[PDB]
Coordinates of C-alpha atoms and ligand atoms in Angstrom, one line a residue:
Chain A
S12 CA -7.9 15.4 -18.4
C13 CA -9.6 15.5 -15.0
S14 CA -11.2 18.2 -12.9
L15 CA -13.1 17.7 -9.6
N16 CA -12.5 20.6 -7.2
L17 CA -15.2 23.2 -8.2
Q18 CA -17.5 20.4 -9.3
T19 CA -21.0 20.2 -8.0
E20 CA -22.8 18.4 -5.1
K21 CA -24.3 15.3 -6.6
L22 CA -25.2 12.7 -3.8
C23 CA -28.3 10.5 -3.7
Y24 CA -28.7 10.1 0.0
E25 CA -31.1 10.9 3.0
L35 CA -34.6 10.4 10.8
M36 CA -35.8 7.6 8.6
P37 CA -33.8 5.8 6.0
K38 CA -35.5 6.1 2.7
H39 CA -33.6 3.1 1.2
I40 CA -32.2 0.1 3.1
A41 CA -30.0 -2.5 1.5
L42 CA -30.0 -6.0 3.0
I43 CA -27.6 -8.9 2.9
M44 CA -29.4 -12.0 4.2
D45 CA -26.7 -14.2 5.7
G46 CA -26.8 -17.1 8.2
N47 CA -29.4 -19.6 6.7
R48 CA -27.3 -22.8 6.6
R49 CA -25.9 -22.2 10.1
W50 CA -29.5 -21.7 11.4
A51 CA -30.6 -25.1 10.1
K52 CA -27.7 -26.9 11.9
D53 CA -28.1 -25.1 15.3
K54 CA -31.8 -26.0 15.5
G55 CA -31.3 -29.3 13.7
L56 CA -33.3 -29.3 10.5
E57 CA -31.9 -30.0 7.0
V58 CA -30.0 -27.2 5.3
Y59 CA -32.8 -27.3 2.9
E60 CA -34.7 -25.5 5.7
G61 CA -33.7 -22.0 6.8
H62 CA -33.6 -21.3 3.1
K63 CA -37.3 -21.9 3.3
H64 CA -37.6 -18.8 5.6
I65 CA -36.2 -16.2 3.3
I66 CA -39.4 -15.2 1.5
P67 CA -41.7 -15.1 4.6
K68 CA -39.1 -13.1 6.5
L69 CA -38.7 -10.8 3.5
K70 CA -42.4 -10.1 3.2
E71 CA -42.5 -9.6 7.0
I72 CA -39.5 -7.1 6.8
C73 CA -41.3 -5.1 4.0
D74 CA -44.5 -4.9 6.1
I75 CA -42.7 -3.5 9.1
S76 CA -40.5 -1.2 6.9
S77 CA -43.4 0.1 4.9
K78 CA -45.2 1.1 8.1
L79 CA -42.1 3.0 9.3
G80 CA -41.8 5.2 6.1
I81 CA -39.1 3.3 4.4
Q82 CA -39.6 3.5 0.6
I83 CA -37.1 1.1 -0.9
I84 CA -35.4 -2.2 0.1
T85 CA -32.7 -3.9 -2.0
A86 CA -32.2 -7.5 -0.9
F87 CA -29.1 -9.6 -1.8
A88 CA -30.4 -13.0 -2.7
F89 CA -27.9 -14.5 -5.1
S90 CA -24.6 -13.1 -6.2
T91 CA -22.5 -14.0 -9.2
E92 CA -20.2 -16.0 -6.9
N93 CA -22.7 -18.5 -5.3
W94 CA -23.2 -20.1 -8.7
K95 CA -20.3 -22.3 -7.4
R96 CA -22.1 -23.5 -4.3
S97 CA -23.2 -27.1 -4.2
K98 CA -24.8 -28.6 -7.3
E99 CA -27.9 -29.6 -5.3
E100 CA -28.2 -26.3 -3.4
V101 CA -28.2 -24.0 -6.5
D102 CA -31.1 -25.9 -8.2
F103 CA -33.1 -25.8 -5.0
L104 CA -32.8 -22.0 -4.4
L105 CA -33.6 -20.9 -7.9
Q106 CA -36.8 -23.0 -7.9
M107 CA -37.8 -21.8 -4.5
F108 CA -37.6 -18.1 -5.4
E109 CA -40.5 -18.7 -7.8
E110 CA -42.7 -18.6 -4.7
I111 CA -42.1 -14.8 -4.8
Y112 CA -45.3 -14.7 -6.9
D113 CA -47.5 -16.2 -4.1
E114 CA -46.3 -13.8 -1.4
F115 CA -46.2 -10.5 -3.2
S116 CA -48.6 -10.5 -6.2
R117 CA -51.6 -9.3 -4.2
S118 CA -49.7 -7.0 -1.8
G119 CA -49.1 -3.3 -2.0
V120 CA -45.5 -4.0 -2.8
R121 CA -43.8 -3.2 -6.2
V122 CA -41.2 -5.8 -7.0
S123 CA -38.2 -5.5 -9.5
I124 CA -35.3 -7.9 -10.1
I125 CA -31.9 -6.7 -11.0
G126 CA -29.2 -8.9 -12.5
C127 CA -28.4 -10.9 -15.6
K128 CA -31.9 -12.4 -16.0
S129 CA -30.9 -13.9 -19.5
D130 CA -28.9 -16.8 -18.0
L131 CA -31.5 -18.3 -15.6
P132 CA -34.0 -21.1 -16.2
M133 CA -36.7 -20.0 -18.7
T134 CA -39.2 -21.0 -16.0
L135 CA -37.7 -18.5 -13.6
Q136 CA -37.4 -15.9 -16.3
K137 CA -41.2 -16.1 -16.8
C138 CA -42.0 -16.0 -13.1
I139 CA -39.9 -12.9 -12.7
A140 CA -41.5 -11.1 -15.7
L141 CA -44.9 -12.0 -14.4
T142 CA -44.2 -10.9 -10.8
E143 CA -42.7 -7.6 -12.1
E144 CA -45.7 -6.9 -14.4
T145 CA -48.4 -7.9 -11.8
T146 CA -46.9 -5.6 -9.1
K147 CA -45.7 -2.8 -11.4
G148 CA -48.7 -0.5 -10.5
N149 CA -48.5 -0.9 -6.7
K150 CA -48.0 2.4 -4.9
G151 CA -46.3 1.0 -1.8
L152 CA -42.8 0.1 -0.9
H153 CA -40.3 -0.8 -3.7
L154 CA -38.7 -4.2 -3.2
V155 CA -35.6 -4.8 -5.5
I156 CA -34.3 -8.4 -5.5
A157 CA -30.7 -8.8 -6.7
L158 CA -30.6 -12.2 -8.5
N159 CA -27.5 -13.2 -10.4
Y160 CA -26.2 -9.7 -9.6
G161 CA -22.9 -8.2 -8.5
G162 CA -21.1 -5.0 -8.1
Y163 CA -18.5 -5.7 -10.8
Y164 CA -21.4 -6.8 -13.1
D165 CA -23.4 -3.6 -12.6
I166 CA -20.4 -1.4 -13.4
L167 CA -19.3 -3.4 -16.4
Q168 CA -22.7 -3.5 -18.1
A169 CA -23.0 0.2 -17.5
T170 CA -19.6 0.6 -19.2
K171 CA -20.4 -1.4 -22.3
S172 CA -23.6 0.6 -22.6
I173 CA -21.6 3.9 -22.4
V174 CA -19.0 2.6 -24.8
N175 CA -21.7 1.6 -27.3
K176 CA -23.3 5.1 -27.2
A177 CA -20.0 6.7 -27.7
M178 CA -19.3 4.6 -30.8
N179 CA -22.6 5.6 -32.3
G180 CA -22.0 9.4 -31.6
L181 CA -24.7 9.6 -29.0
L182 CA -22.2 11.1 -26.5
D183 CA -18.6 12.0 -26.1
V184 CA -15.9 11.4 -23.4
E185 CA -16.7 14.8 -21.8
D186 CA -20.2 13.7 -21.2
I187 CA -19.1 10.8 -18.9
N188 CA -19.9 11.8 -15.3
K189 CA -21.6 10.7 -12.1
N190 CA -25.1 11.4 -13.4
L191 CA -24.6 9.6 -16.7
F192 CA -23.2 6.5 -14.8
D193 CA -26.1 6.6 -12.4
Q194 CA -28.6 6.5 -15.3
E195 CA -26.9 3.4 -16.8
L196 CA -26.6 1.3 -13.6
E197 CA -29.4 -1.2 -12.6
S198 CA -29.5 0.0 -9.0
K199 CA -30.2 3.8 -9.3
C200 CA -30.6 6.8 -7.2
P201 CA -31.7 7.2 -4.4
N202 CA -28.8 5.1 -3.0
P203 CA -29.0 3.0 0.3
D204 CA -28.9 5.1 3.5
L205 CA -28.4 2.0 5.5
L206 CA -26.9 -1.4 4.7
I207 CA -27.8 -4.3 7.1
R208 CA -25.7 -7.5 7.1
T209 CA -26.9 -10.4 9.3
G210 CA -24.7 -13.4 9.8
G211 CA -21.6 -11.9 11.5
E212 CA -19.4 -11.3 8.4
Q213 CA -18.1 -7.7 8.0
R214 CA -17.7 -7.1 4.3
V215 CA -19.9 -6.4 1.3
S216 CA -18.9 -9.4 -0.9
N217 CA -19.4 -7.8 -4.3
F218 CA -23.0 -6.6 -3.6
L219 CA -23.5 -3.0 -4.4
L220 CA -20.2 -1.1 -4.9
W221 CA -20.8 2.2 -6.7
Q222 CA -24.0 2.7 -4.6
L223 CA -22.5 2.3 -1.1
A224 CA -20.1 5.3 -1.3
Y225 CA -21.7 7.1 1.7
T226 CA -24.0 4.3 3.1
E227 CA -24.1 3.7 6.9
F228 CA -23.1 0.1 7.7
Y229 CA -24.8 -2.0 10.4
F230 CA -23.5 -5.5 11.1
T231 CA -25.1 -8.1 13.4
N232 CA -24.4 -11.7 14.4
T233 CA -28.1 -12.6 14.3
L234 CA -28.7 -15.3 11.7
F235 CA -31.2 -14.1 9.1
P236 CA -34.2 -16.4 10.2
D237 CA -33.8 -15.0 13.7
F238 CA -33.9 -11.4 12.4
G239 CA -37.3 -10.1 13.6
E240 CA -39.1 -6.8 14.1
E241 CA -37.1 -6.2 17.3
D242 CA -33.7 -6.6 15.5
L243 CA -34.8 -4.3 12.7
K244 CA -35.8 -1.6 15.1
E245 CA -32.5 -1.8 16.8
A246 CA -30.8 -1.3 13.4
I247 CA -32.9 1.7 12.6
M248 CA -32.3 3.3 16.0
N249 CA -28.6 2.8 15.6
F250 CA -28.7 4.5 12.2
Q251 CA -30.6 7.5 13.8
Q252 CA -27.8 8.0 16.3
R253 CA -25.2 8.5 13.5
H254 CA -23.8 11.8 12.2
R255 CA -23.4 11.9 8.4
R256 CA -21.0 14.6 7.1
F257 CA -20.6 13.6 3.4
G258 CA -17.0 14.9 3.4
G259 CA -17.9 18.3 4.9
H260 CA -18.2 19.9 8.3
Chain B
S12 CA -25.7 -9.7 -23.7
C13 CA -24.4 -10.7 -20.3
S14 CA -22.7 -13.9 -19.2
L15 CA -21.6 -14.4 -15.5
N16 CA -21.0 -18.0 -14.4
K21 CA -9.2 -12.5 -9.8
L22 CA -5.4 -12.3 -9.8
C23 CA -6.0 -9.8 -6.9
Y24 CA -6.7 -10.2 -3.2
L35 CA -2.6 -14.9 7.7
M36 CA -0.8 -11.7 7.4
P37 CA -2.5 -9.2 5.0
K38 CA -0.5 -8.3 2.0
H39 CA -2.4 -5.0 1.2
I40 CA -3.9 -2.8 3.9
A41 CA -6.2 0.1 3.0
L42 CA -6.4 2.9 5.6
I43 CA -8.9 5.7 6.2
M44 CA -7.2 8.3 8.5
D45 CA -10.3 9.8 10.1
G46 CA -10.7 11.6 13.5
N47 CA -8.2 14.5 13.4
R48 CA -10.4 17.4 14.2
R49 CA -12.2 15.8 17.2
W50 CA -8.8 14.7 18.5
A51 CA -7.6 18.3 18.5
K52 CA -10.8 19.8 20.0
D53 CA -10.9 17.3 22.8
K54 CA -7.4 18.3 23.8
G55 CA -8.2 22.0 23.8
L56 CA -6.0 22.4 20.6
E57 CA -6.7 24.3 17.4
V58 CA -8.1 22.1 14.7
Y59 CA -4.8 22.4 12.7
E60 CA -2.8 20.7 15.4
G61 CA -4.7 17.5 14.6
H62 CA -3.9 17.6 10.9
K63 CA -0.1 18.1 11.6
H64 CA -0.1 14.5 13.0
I65 CA -1.3 12.9 9.7
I66 CA 2.0 12.6 7.8
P67 CA 4.2 11.7 10.8
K68 CA 1.7 9.1 12.0
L69 CA 1.5 7.6 8.6
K70 CA 5.3 7.3 8.3
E71 CA 5.3 5.6 11.7
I72 CA 2.6 3.2 10.5
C73 CA 4.7 2.4 7.4
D74 CA 7.8 1.5 9.6
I75 CA 5.7 -0.8 11.8
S76 CA 4.0 -2.4 8.9
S77 CA 7.2 -3.0 7.0
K78 CA 8.5 -5.1 10.0
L79 CA 5.3 -7.2 10.0
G80 CA 5.7 -8.2 6.4
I81 CA 3.0 -5.9 4.9
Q82 CA 3.8 -5.0 1.3
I83 CA 1.3 -2.3 0.3
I84 CA -0.6 0.5 2.2
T85 CA -3.2 2.7 0.5
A86 CA -4.1 5.7 2.7
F87 CA -6.9 8.2 2.2
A88 CA -5.5 11.7 2.7
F89 CA -8.0 14.0 0.9
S90 CA -11.2 13.0 -0.9
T91 CA -13.0 14.7 -3.8
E92 CA -15.6 15.8 -1.2
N93 CA -13.3 17.5 1.2
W94 CA -13.3 20.6 -1.1
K95 CA -16.5 21.5 0.8
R96 CA -14.7 22.5 4.0
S97 CA -13.7 26.1 4.5
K98 CA -11.1 27.8 2.3
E99 CA -8.9 28.2 5.3
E100 CA -9.0 24.5 6.1
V101 CA -8.5 23.4 2.5
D102 CA -5.6 25.8 2.0
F103 CA -3.8 24.7 5.2
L104 CA -4.2 21.0 4.1
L105 CA -3.0 21.4 0.5
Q106 CA -0.1 23.5 1.9
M107 CA 0.6 20.9 4.6
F108 CA 0.8 18.0 2.2
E109 CA 4.0 19.4 0.7
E110 CA 5.6 18.0 3.9
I111 CA 5.3 14.6 2.1
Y112 CA 8.6 15.4 0.4
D113 CA 10.3 16.1 3.7
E114 CA 9.0 13.0 5.5
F115 CA 9.5 10.4 2.8
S116 CA 12.1 11.4 0.2
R117 CA 15.0 10.0 2.3
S118 CA 13.1 7.0 3.9
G119 CA 13.0 3.4 2.8
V120 CA 9.4 3.6 1.6
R121 CA 8.4 3.7 -2.1
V122 CA 5.7 6.3 -2.6
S123 CA 2.9 6.9 -5.2
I124 CA 0.0 9.3 -5.4
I125 CA -3.4 8.5 -6.9
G126 CA -6.0 11.2 -7.6
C127 CA -6.5 14.1 -9.9
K128 CA -3.2 15.9 -9.5
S129 CA -4.0 18.7 -12.0
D130 CA -6.6 20.3 -9.6
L131 CA -3.8 20.8 -7.0
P132 CA -1.5 23.8 -6.5
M133 CA 1.3 23.6 -9.0
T134 CA 3.7 23.7 -6.0
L135 CA 2.1 20.5 -4.5
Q136 CA 2.2 18.9 -7.9
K137 CA 6.0 19.4 -7.9
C138 CA 6.5 18.1 -4.4
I139 CA 4.5 15.0 -5.4
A140 CA 6.4 14.4 -8.6
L141 CA 9.7 14.8 -6.7
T142 CA 8.6 12.4 -3.9
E143 CA 7.7 9.8 -6.5
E144 CA 10.9 10.3 -8.4
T145 CA 13.4 10.1 -5.5
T146 CA 11.7 7.0 -3.9
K147 CA 10.9 5.0 -7.1
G148 CA 13.8 2.6 -6.5
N149 CA 13.0 1.7 -2.9
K150 CA 12.5 -2.0 -2.4
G151 CA 10.5 -1.8 0.8
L152 CA 6.9 -1.2 1.5
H153 CA 4.9 0.5 -1.2
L154 CA 2.9 3.5 0.2
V155 CA 0.0 4.7 -2.1
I156 CA -1.4 8.1 -1.0
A157 CA -4.9 9.0 -2.3
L158 CA -4.9 12.8 -2.6
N159 CA -8.0 14.4 -4.3
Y160 CA -9.2 10.9 -4.9
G161 CA -12.6 9.2 -4.9
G162 CA -14.1 5.9 -6.0
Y163 CA -16.5 7.7 -8.3
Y164 CA -13.6 9.6 -10.0
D165 CA -11.5 6.4 -10.4
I166 CA -14.3 4.4 -12.1
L167 CA -15.2 7.4 -14.3
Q168 CA -11.6 7.9 -15.5
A169 CA -11.2 4.2 -16.1
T170 CA -14.4 4.4 -18.3
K171 CA -13.2 7.4 -20.4
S172 CA -9.9 5.5 -21.0
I173 CA -11.9 2.4 -22.1
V174 CA -14.1 4.6 -24.4
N175 CA -11.0 6.2 -26.1
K176 CA -9.5 2.8 -26.8
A177 CA -12.7 1.7 -28.4
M178 CA -12.9 4.8 -30.6
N179 CA -9.3 4.1 -31.6
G180 CA -10.1 0.5 -32.7
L181 CA -8.2 -1.1 -29.9
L182 CA -11.0 -3.2 -28.3
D183 CA -14.6 -4.2 -28.8
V184 CA -17.4 -4.0 -26.4
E185 CA -17.3 -7.8 -26.1
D186 CA -13.7 -7.4 -24.7
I187 CA -14.9 -5.4 -21.7
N188 CA -14.4 -7.4 -18.5
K189 CA -13.1 -7.5 -15.0
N190 CA -9.5 -7.8 -16.0
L191 CA -9.5 -5.0 -18.5
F192 CA -11.3 -2.7 -16.0
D193 CA -8.7 -3.5 -13.3
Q194 CA -5.8 -2.4 -15.5
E195 CA -7.3 1.0 -16.2
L196 CA -8.0 1.9 -12.5
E197 CA -5.5 4.0 -10.5
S198 CA -5.4 1.4 -7.7
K199 CA -4.8 -2.0 -9.2
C200 CA -4.4 -5.6 -8.2
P201 CA -3.7 -7.0 -5.7
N202 CA -6.7 -5.4 -3.9
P203 CA -6.7 -4.6 -0.2
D204 CA -7.2 -7.6 2.1
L205 CA -8.1 -5.5 5.1
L206 CA -9.6 -2.0 5.5
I207 CA -8.9 -0.1 8.7
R208 CA -11.0 3.0 9.5
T209 CA -10.1 5.1 12.6
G210 CA -12.5 7.7 13.9
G211 CA -15.5 5.7 14.9
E212 CA -17.7 6.0 11.8
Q213 CA -18.9 2.9 9.9
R214 CA -18.9 3.8 6.1
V215 CA -16.3 4.0 3.4
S216 CA -16.9 7.7 2.3
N217 CA -16.2 7.2 -1.5
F218 CA -12.8 5.5 -1.0
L219 CA -11.7 2.5 -3.1
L220 CA -15.2 1.3 -4.2
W221 CA -14.3 -1.3 -6.8
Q222 CA -11.2 -2.5 -5.0
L223 CA -13.0 -3.2 -1.7
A224 CA -15.5 -5.8 -3.1
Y225 CA -14.1 -8.6 -0.9
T226 CA -12.1 -6.6 1.6
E227 CA -12.5 -7.2 5.4
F228 CA -13.9 -4.1 7.1
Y229 CA -12.3 -3.1 10.4
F230 CA -13.8 -0.1 12.2
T231 CA -12.3 1.3 15.4
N232 CA -13.2 4.3 17.7
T233 CA -9.5 5.1 18.1
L234 CA -8.8 8.6 16.6
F235 CA -6.1 8.6 14.0
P236 CA -3.4 10.5 16.0
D237 CA -3.8 7.9 18.8
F238 CA -3.5 4.9 16.4
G239 CA -0.4 3.0 17.5
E240 CA 1.4 -0.3 17.1
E241 CA -1.0 -2.1 19.5
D242 CA -4.1 -0.9 17.7
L243 CA -2.6 -2.1 14.5
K244 CA -1.8 -5.6 15.9
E245 CA -5.3 -5.9 17.3
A246 CA -6.7 -5.2 13.8
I247 CA -4.5 -7.8 12.2
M248 CA -5.5 -10.3 14.9
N249 CA -9.2 -9.6 14.1
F250 CA -8.4 -10.3 10.4
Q251 CA -6.8 -13.6 11.2
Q252 CA -9.8 -14.7 13.2
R253 CA -12.2 -13.7 10.4
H254 CA -10.2 -15.9 8.0
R255 CA -10.5 -19.0 10.2
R256 CA -14.3 -18.4 10.5
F257 CA -15.1 -17.8 6.8
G258 CA -12.6 -19.7 4.7
Ligands
IPE301 C1 -18.0 -18.7 -0.7 C2 -18.3 -18.8 0.6 C3 -17.1 -18.7 1.6 C4 -19.7 -19.1 1.1 C5 -20.6 -17.9 0.6 O1 -21.4 -17.3 1.6 P1 -22.1 -15.9 1.3 O2 -23.1 -16.0 0.2 O3 -22.8 -15.5 2.6 O4 -20.9 -14.8 0.9 P2 -19.6 -14.6 1.8 O5 -19.8 -15.3 3.1 O6 -18.4 -15.2 1.1 O7 -19.3 -13.1 2.1
IPE302 C1 -9.5 12.0 3.7 C2 -10.4 11.2 4.3 C3 -10.0 10.3 5.4 C4 -11.9 11.2 3.8 C5 -12.8 10.5 4.8 O1 -13.0 11.3 6.0 P1 -14.3 12.2 6.1 O2 -14.4 12.9 7.4 O3 -14.4 13.2 4.9 O4 -15.6 11.2 5.9 P2 -17.2 11.5 6.4 O5 -17.3 11.3 7.9 O6 -17.6 12.9 6.1 O7 -18.0 10.5 5.6
DST303 C1 -26.3 -15.9 0.0 C2 -27.6 -16.7 0.4 C3 -28.5 -17.3 -0.7 C4 -27.8 -16.9 1.7 C5 -26.9 -16.3 2.7 S1 -27.1 -17.3 4.1 P1 -26.0 -19.1 3.7 O1 -26.9 -20.0 2.8 O2 -24.8 -18.7 2.9 O3 -25.7 -19.8 5.2 P2 -24.4 -19.6 6.1 O4 -23.8 -18.2 5.9 O5 -23.4 -20.6 5.7 O6 -24.8 -19.7 7.6
DST304 C1 -7.6 13.1 6.6 C2 -8.7 14.2 6.4 C3 -8.4 15.4 5.5 C4 -9.8 14.0 7.0 C5 -10.0 12.7 7.8 S1 -9.8 13.3 9.6 P1 -11.1 14.9 9.9 O1 -10.6 16.2 9.4 O2 -12.4 14.6 9.1 O3 -11.4 14.9 11.5 P2 -12.9 14.7 12.1 O4 -13.6 13.5 11.4 O5 -13.8 15.9 11.9 O6 -12.8 14.4 13.6
MG305 MG1 -23.2 -17.0 4.0
MG306 MG1 -13.8 12.8 9.3

């Protein structure tokens, strides 16, 4: 039995985006066009990311969720997967002495135990920082987030900790790994115009911004153009 | 315990459609806002006839979201009343028509027009038109979860059986998912439409207001889609 008409206003959104989501596309192409190995360009993810957080933090942006590794690029090249997972360990060097709090969402339990330790250390070292919250989606996906939230709700219902009539938008928010407040703005570099199983639940009323700029070329100027674009946009949330 | 590493998804088989821009179309032409909404169903029928000729098999169209209840009483009543016209426009066409959404919130009269429209068209072999009325992506994922929870409490599945396939079969919009999404009206957002189903869908946004969306705008969108597929495939 369903009822949705007189139900409440329950939306985790909104001149400055509080939360920006980011899909970092274009790295392999950027190596080719300049000439370097495709190893490179992937080298620029972490420095660019630190740079983006610096600019963003200065502007008043409070959260950034960055899409590093989906559940689908486990089937990219055998050599390229082993490279990227080991390179992300250098998160520790770049962020551990910053004002940046750092969390990782995804199925951590399937990664190299080395990487599991680096993530736990990076999370604990930065947990007290008062600055901008940087969430890194690693071995994450939209289907994944919704399914694990569902198993967790099913398990509670089987142990009498809730019933079917408790299952609503707030309950589901509390079980998902990416929580309120949801992204006001999604930025995808690299020219593709889709979400590719990143967030799904969370994007319900996000403003989308797509650019052809490859990610290593995405500098302060490009980021300000994205934020000005967003500020020109009229958000109605289904109303008038 | 999680473990990670689709019998869904050049001519798109399933198109998803967000029919936005009706009030601004009216107001620009000096017309009352309700003149805009009177073009929704006729335009949608016209788009079904064009799509059927192109080989498209499914269209899922956003007619009323769970958030549109926030407009004025006058605007809501006109729309729920106007959607009874679905019976007139489609009962004697070649389109097969289904409605997704929480029907029990609607006026009992509209519930009857809907049930009659589904009944009279159920045998049509042509294009399948799915109309999302009082629908939302939040709603659809929540109702799929409650259904999964009740199966568990009746001993029909374990938590370790919960996966992408089981979840798809509980949702109101099922596989195959939309290949292409077309949103008229100029805005770049999905507005709580088919959240789970759009994971790999191509997003096509256009400034053309819905009452102006014609055959050539539709052919341009499909041509964009075919270009994207050569690029990222
Ligand atoms: C599987 C393919 C085609 C390459 C993956 O590239 P991304 O990680 O950028 O994701 P999509 O291009 O598929 O959206
Ligand atoms: C029935 C439809 C097409 C809902 C989306 O249109 P809206 O006008 O409600 O979307 P927003 O601009 O408010 O996000
Ligand atoms: C998804 C990740 C890790 C990076 C996105 S950039 P890429 O490596 O997929 O490079 P291209 O899109 O092929 O140019
Ligand atoms: C189809 C419905 C009910 C809404 C989408 S069109 P609209 O009423 O939102 O018109 P505007 O976006 O206000 O121009
Ligand atoms: Mg890519
Ligand atoms: Mg609108």
